[PDB]
Symmetry: C4
Subunit: 387 residues, 4 copies
Amino acid sequence: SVKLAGNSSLCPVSGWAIYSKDNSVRIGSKGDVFVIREPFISCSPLECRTFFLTQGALLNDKHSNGTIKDRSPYRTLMSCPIGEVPSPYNSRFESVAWSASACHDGINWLTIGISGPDNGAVAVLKYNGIITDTIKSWRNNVLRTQESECACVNGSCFTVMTDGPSNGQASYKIFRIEKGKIVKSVEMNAPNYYYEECSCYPDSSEITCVCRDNWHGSNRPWVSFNQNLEYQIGYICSGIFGDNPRPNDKTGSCGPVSSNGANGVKGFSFKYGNGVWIGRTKSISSRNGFEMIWDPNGWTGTDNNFSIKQDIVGINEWSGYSGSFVQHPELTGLDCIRPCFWVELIRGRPKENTIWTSGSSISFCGVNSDTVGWSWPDGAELPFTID
Amino acid sequence: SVKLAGNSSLCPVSGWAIYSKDNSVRIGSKGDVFVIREPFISCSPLECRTFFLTQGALLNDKHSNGTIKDRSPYRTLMSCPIGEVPSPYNSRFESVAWSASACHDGINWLTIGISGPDNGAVAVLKYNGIITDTIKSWRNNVLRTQESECACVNGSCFTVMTDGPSNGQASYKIFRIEKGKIVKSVEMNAPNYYYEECSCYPDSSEITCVCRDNWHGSNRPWVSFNQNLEYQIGYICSGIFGDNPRPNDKTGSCGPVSSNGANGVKGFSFKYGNGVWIGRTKSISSRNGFEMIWDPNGWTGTDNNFSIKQDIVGINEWSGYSGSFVQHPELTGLDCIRPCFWVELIRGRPKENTIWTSGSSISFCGVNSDTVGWSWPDGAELPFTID
Amino acid sequence: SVKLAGNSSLCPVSGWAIYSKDNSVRIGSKGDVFVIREPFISCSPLECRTFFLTQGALLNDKHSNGTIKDRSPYRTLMSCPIGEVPSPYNSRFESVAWSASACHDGINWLTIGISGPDNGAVAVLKYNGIITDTIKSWRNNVLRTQESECACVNGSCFTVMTDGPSNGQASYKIFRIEKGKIVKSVEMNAPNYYYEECSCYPDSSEITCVCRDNWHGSNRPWVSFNQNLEYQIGYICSGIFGDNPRPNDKTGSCGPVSSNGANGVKGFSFKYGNGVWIGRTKSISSRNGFEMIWDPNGWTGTDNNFSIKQDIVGINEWSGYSGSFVQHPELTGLDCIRPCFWVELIRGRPKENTIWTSGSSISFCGVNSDTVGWSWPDGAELPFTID
Amino acid sequence: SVKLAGNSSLCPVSGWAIYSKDNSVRIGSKGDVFVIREPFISCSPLECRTFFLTQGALLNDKHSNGTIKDRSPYRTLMSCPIGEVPSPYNSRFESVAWSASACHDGINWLTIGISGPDNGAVAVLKYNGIITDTIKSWRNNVLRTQESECACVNGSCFTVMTDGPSNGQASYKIFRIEKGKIVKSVEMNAPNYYYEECSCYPDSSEITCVCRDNWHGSNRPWVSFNQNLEYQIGYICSGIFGDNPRPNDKTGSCGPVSSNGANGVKGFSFKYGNGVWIGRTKSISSRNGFEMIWDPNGWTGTDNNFSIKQDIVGINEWSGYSGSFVQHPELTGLDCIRPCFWVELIRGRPKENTIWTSGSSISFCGVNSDTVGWSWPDGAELPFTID
Ligand SMILES: *[C@@H]1O[C@H](CO)[C@@H](O[C@@H]2O[C@H](CO)[C@@H](O[C@@H]3O[C@H](CO[C@H]4O[C@H](CO)[C@@H](O)[C@H](O)[C@@H]4O)[C@@H](O)[C@H](O[C@H]4O[C@H](CO)[C@@H](O)[C@H](O)[C@@H]4O)[C@@H]3O)[C@H](O)[C@H]2NC(C)=O)[C@H](O)[C@H]1NC(C)=O
Ligand SMILES: *[C@@H]1O[C@H](CO)[C@@H](O[C@H]2O[C@H](CO)[C@@H](O)[C@H](O)[C@H]2NC(C)=O)[C@H](O)[C@H]1NC(C)=O
Ligand SMILES: CCC(CC)O[C@@H]1C=C(C(=O)O)C[C@H](N)[C@H]1NC(C)=O
Ligand SMILES: CCC(CC)O[C@@H]1C=C(C(=O)O)C[C@H](N)[C@H]1NC(C)=O
Ligand SMILES: CCC(CC)O[C@@H]1C=C(C(=O)O)C[C@H](N)[C@H]1NC(C)=O
Ligand SMILES: CCC(CC)O[C@@H]1C=C(C(=O)O)C[C@H](N)[C@H]1NC(C)=O
Ligand SMILES: *[C@@H]1O[C@H](CO)[C@@H](O)[C@H](O)[C@H]1NC(C)=O
Ligand SMILES: *[C@@H]1O[C@H](CO)[C@@H](O)[C@H](O)[C@H]1NC(C)=O
Ligand SMILES: *[C@@H]1O[C@H](CO)[C@@H](O)[C@H](O)[C@H]1NC(C)=O
Ligand SMILES: *[C@@H]1O[C@H](CO)[C@@H](O)[C@H](O)[C@H]1NC(C)=O
Ligand SMILES: *[C@@H]1O[C@H](CO)[C@@H](O)[C@H](O)[C@H]1NC(C)=O
Ligand SMILES: *[C@@H]1O[C@H](CO)[C@@H](O)[C@H](O)[C@H]1NC(C)=O
Ligand SMILES: *[C@@H]1O[C@H](CO)[C@@H](O)[C@H](O)[C@H]1NC(C)=O
Ligand SMILES: *[C@@H]1O[C@H](CO)[C@@H](O)[C@H](O)[C@H]1NC(C)=O
Ligand SMILES: *[C@@H]1O[C@H](CO)[C@@H](O)[C@H](O)[C@H]1NC(C)=O
Ligand SMILES: [Ca+2]
Ligand SMILES: [Ca+2]
Ligand SMILES: [Ca+2]
Ligand SMILES: [Ca+2]
Ligand SMILES: [Ca+2]
Ligand SMILES: [Ca+2]
Ligand SMILES: [Ca+2]
Ligand SMILES: [Ca+2]
Ligand SMILES: [Ca+2]
Ligand code: NA
């Protein structure tokens, strides 16, 4: 058992091969499946797991009523093996949480679960399931974190948290965590930027995060930093705008794009020099479809020209959150950090006529062998009996 | 595999971080979850587990009827991982039981399960699941034990059992157990005191139990003892009365407080010199709400002043039993024994219009980092389909 | 990993302490629990498991119809941990079977599953889940075996099978099995005896079996043998008759007792010199109640006097099959082979008005510490929804 | 962990002993069991597993509707222990897949899952659950593979895939795979032959596959090859025709038998010099019944005489796909590779009045000890509540 090095570079990839699909909402029509949202995948050196925030309720049961609501004392962070439906009969309990992150350092799992009131929430940190630290709201306004895996390099794990309004300037902090203990934190000097729900990955011993600007950006903000949390900030320049909502593609910007910039969705991108692989919704106005786009100058260039598009979910199908996850050399035997991604397929409120909201997931891993575009949607037939 | 030392002091703590919530009643509306009461938590050097008394029945099925009744031949002690719902599909069988205790000495689990008739019940003790001893009622009036973890120091484990009436003087025995074999017991000389449902923990090689006076005490009795079962007795002196029911807070006593003293609820407290961390309901008359209070002179002083209160369950929400559990340094890597606690959130009879009674649970661990009060209640909407 | 020696003697016991209870029929009212009959318990050096023959159907579902029927191609031998309900979500598959045995030699499990036609059934033998032998019907008339654990001594396991009519002379064979291969078999010369559903245990390197005489005996037949299968035969002499049905107690006999001798129930007894611990039903006419009786001269003496009676199930409660199981020193750390027993609590047809028949279980281990009689019945309220 | 040698010969067998039956459809009347088809069994050096293609839906739920359809984005390759029902609570996720194969090389599991569109499907290969390679359709017409285990010899695993029309000449490729990487493939020169759904097994370091001619053969095509993918081709010569549909038995041919040759069913056979063990349906026109036949000159001789027949499923009962699996010496301790087989028992559409199609399974292993013919059918009573 050894710490993940995290010192190799990301594997360059040409396409995305399908890795998992859980069908949770379809199975939940009869089976005992948690109502969940905000799922994500994270791997150890031995396995990949899906983490998710339950609503303390099963699908097709009356307790799923009102699960559009984001924060309650019932919500818990749990995990199961990748591609299995999240059930009380296969799910490991992690934390009481309405916002979370998790990652494995090579030795044990770090989990971060935030609960408590909007005016004073507390992140509880656990290492191997023992509480090892806490951090409390410093702006008293919905302390919130990634909803995806943290990133680890040589025994240190890193995450981003946000505290403040969701329609204006907020405060953003970056953390270094070792064996579940916060050993350093810094508050970002980022005037006119906004960051939340960051998707962060390791790459050549450094951390890159691509986040959501809910304030006034239709492109995605990024922050990268080293083990000492010395950081750099920007927005993805590509005119292939990554957020949802967003305008139609056109010339981009290296700061925040204000057009359709308010609101957003969690997402990700991978940086390869001046190029970028963007995952995004296919619809500009709602969480519908999903596609991956390789723009070989999109990190720093502002044109809307790109070279590869691979379909993942069809434009008439419900999508949702998406996030990065990696497979390290210690897991794969490769000489590089493999990029993967998951997509959350949201069903129910607000877009459908149900009492509940819940998601399934799909996930894909980067390869340089042949791949194909298609649509792998949630597949459930709504409404359900309970509705 | 090594014996827990049990020789360090209790970790000093400033507040309580949420550790687990299982949502059992919410989930059992649809899923297959045991009807249970008398849950508790106990840890080995490798994991923590929820122990509970089943009713041999599942939520929202007809055999849930009558489960207000405490003692039957159908009740079984079973256990599942912390924060998971207790289900037939995830629960390990421990013992046939309508009163129980369990604790891990560092090598194997000890379990104590009392079944049989009210006039001659028998505790069956198991070590690693094998029957290693029995002990029979010696007063023929409902032999009963902790309903929370026993406590272990250097390969010996300790518990308390009571036999006799619940509305007057009863008999109270302390036991030293090694590899599931009773090696010593003493009957306590405790005239005008009453002990049941003790929450016992180790602290610097000695055991301290805080219990329930069902006879005539609205404050809690305590007994502390060494590995030779040489014991000291007393009641918590604080005017912050710990039992339910109780009077409003006023000047306390170091003997039993007779005002509102009859009846009770299982609870716990932690001694820190002359100070005390008290867990109690928020209502003085029913099992509603829960709070943690630090009273720096409350173990020995009778005033009703305290220095810290942390809300756990709101006053208008159902609560129930509570107990202590510890995390030893062999589990955590700390230099001290960490105090934690669980609360049972009882739903159904006698307070609600159901045919059944069952609980869910929440637990917290003591920390010195930032924490917050809130309410994490059961959350189920009663009555259910079967009612 | 080492072979069970099997060379110590049975632990003398003074009473029976309750070990497990599954509540399967109560739980199966809503949960996903197999319809089963013919359960039994068997232990390895690490754990005890319950084996059972499913009917390829779940309780309270339409496929449980007609499960009074003994033999079908749907019936399977499965196992789960002791005291858990048998569900498809916790159950290990063993063999396709309508009659069975299993036992662990210290290294691996042996399972014996008989299926196929009444006129040519085949026992399939498996070691560690691999098929290692078969034995086919030699009288073409329902080849059948113990429905309880086989017995192992020094790497050899032993069982008994029967082939022929159930209302007359049949044929009875004894088998020695090593690593799942039949290494010797003998046909018993036992004119005027009848043996089936033998409960067999090791004791001082030899096997004792106590069986069912369905032809013309209301006491139980026995056969004991060494590793070479050189055997002796007799019937339990005590006037405390062990079978069901049977007459009221009176002077017994050392050969078959013809009064109420046709028909029967699987059962067991333990021999301790000239004395016997007898488990039997409390009713003389039907499968109701259960009790254990220590008769200090009952193996070889014919009087109906006895020393100890311990109630297990009350006379107005349903019982059923019962069988021996042992815990070897390699499991317990004792210097003797510990005797235990289980009882099948049968519900449904033919005594109740249901479409199905299915059983739960209770089990007890022998101890020399204090015990108590009680009733631990099945507890389900019939009929069920499906009826 | 050591690589399976795969260099010994097939064990000679006189008959087939029943190994497993899962009763999936019967159990899924109430419990949470996947709608599935295309099951198959494959073994590591430590256990045997059932692999199957789910429909992303449970039996007796509305999302089972339309499951006659073969290919969708919801289908997933998943696995559970042999003989257990495939449930979301006991099944391991393998791959997104509407056509599949898997096999264990002695060190790790290889899985092959084809998803994507009919005009450009992609097989995703995983080794130990990590994506190790992909291969894309090369004729753009439903890339498809074995629906049974691939075959392994000294660290290399072999499979066959087909691409093109199912009512005419298509293209057939053989693959050598090492640690989940395709290291060699060849396209077969096979004019006038047709191969799909190959059942492949190792025998003396070489692979023999018996497949389905959906174009114009009522006998089965075979291809055998060495580790270099040097291959020989042929059809089974026996006038005991192996496909469904087929003619009644008459003189066979060593080329495709065109009488009733169109359409087909996945099946298997085992070669023993000039002889052959044939598994087939009992009906000549529909997937009903199953029997095993030993024809001592049937691999190369065209007569319709055989030496042994062993009933498996009766003629009036539903059957389906069948395939081979092996137990290598590293698992059994034998000196030869043991042949086994499974049969899928298909229920629902198109033959029955349901909204859904699903299968259960049975399997058998080859022995030289005594065996018996019988019928072990699915057993479920259709239609179901949902229909
Ligand atoms: C939760 O649990 C409670 C407590 O048990 C249930 O309340 C019981 O409900 C049952 C069923 O309704 C009651 O049992 C019934 O009693 C009837 C009347 O019994 C008395 O009066 C008759 C004369 O009419 C006398 O013959 C008899 O000796 C009694 O003095 C009976 O008529 C019913 O009998 C029928 O069913 C039985 C099954 O054994 C048949 O054998 C009979 O022939 C007959 O067909 C029946 O026994 C019982 O009294 C209630 N108990 C209490 C304490 O009130 C709740 O119903 C339950 N709730 C839910 C939701 O399940
Ligand atoms: C339920 O089982 C009954 C019997 O209890 C079924 O009736 C027939 O099939 C059985 C085969 O197992 C036999 O046991 C019966 O003797 C036989 N004939 C009868 C009762 O006349 C009956 O068809 C089944 N019920 C349902 C709902 O299908
Ligand atoms: C709290 C503001 C933030 C951005 C608007 O809300 C997020 C939006 C969500 C969304 O856009 O779907 C779902 C997240 N669960 C929620 N996070 C929390 C902590 O409640
Ligand atoms: C036996 C008397 C005792 C104190 C009143 O009853 C306890 C009270 C209970 C309670 O106050 O909720 C529930 C406990 N399950 C019960 N213990 C037993 C062994 O039945
Ligand atoms: C086969 C005759 C035998 C004795 C009457 O029947 C047994 C009786 C039974 C019984 O008396 O309850 C149940 C057993 N499952 C059955 N065994 C078999 C193989 O069917
Ligand atoms: C694609 C052609 C092929 C042969 C007709 O269809 C198969 C026939 C099937 C059948 O005959 O039952 C079911 C298989 N699931 C299907 N394979 C695929 C990949 O869909
Ligand atoms: C990465 O870290 C490993 C393990 O410590 C080290 O041996 C190696 O020199 C470093 N870099 C690369 C790119 O392999
Ligand atoms: C959902 O909650 C609303 C408002 O509290 C209520 O009207 C409705 O009955 C609920 N539906 C269900 C199925 O519980
Ligand atoms: C990794 O961390 C360890 C322990 O802090 C340290 O010894 C080592 O130098 C670090 N390696 C790098 C490349 O930073
Ligand atoms: C506690 O016990 C340990 C382990 O036996 C021993 O080595 C140590 O000296 C003791 N520590 C304290 C704080 O008393
Ligand atoms: C712990 O127990 C062992 C065995 O009884 C004993 O030798 C040792 O002295 C004990 N340690 C203490 C500190 O009591
Ligand atoms: C039992 O067998 C053990 C282990 O082989 C042996 O050491 C011992 O002598 C035997 N005991 C008796 C009483 O025969
Ligand atoms: C037990 O079996 C082994 C191996 O056959 C043999 O060597 C040994 O003598 C046997 N022991 C006894 C006590 O018979
Ligand atoms: C097969 O291979 C094994 C292991 O490599 C070797 O030892 C043996 O000689 C070979 N066996 C046969 C039957 O050829
Ligand atoms: C099944 O699917 C068909 C086609 O969409 C539809 O017409 C039918 O109503 C569905 N039936 C059920 C019972 O859901
Ligand atoms: Ca935005
Ligand atoms: Ca560009
Ligand atoms: Ca009191
Ligand atoms: Ca005070
Ligand atoms: Ca008899
Ligand atoms: Ca006597
Ligand atoms: Ca259910
Ligand atoms: Ca054909
Ligand atoms: Ca021939
Ligand atoms: Na009956």
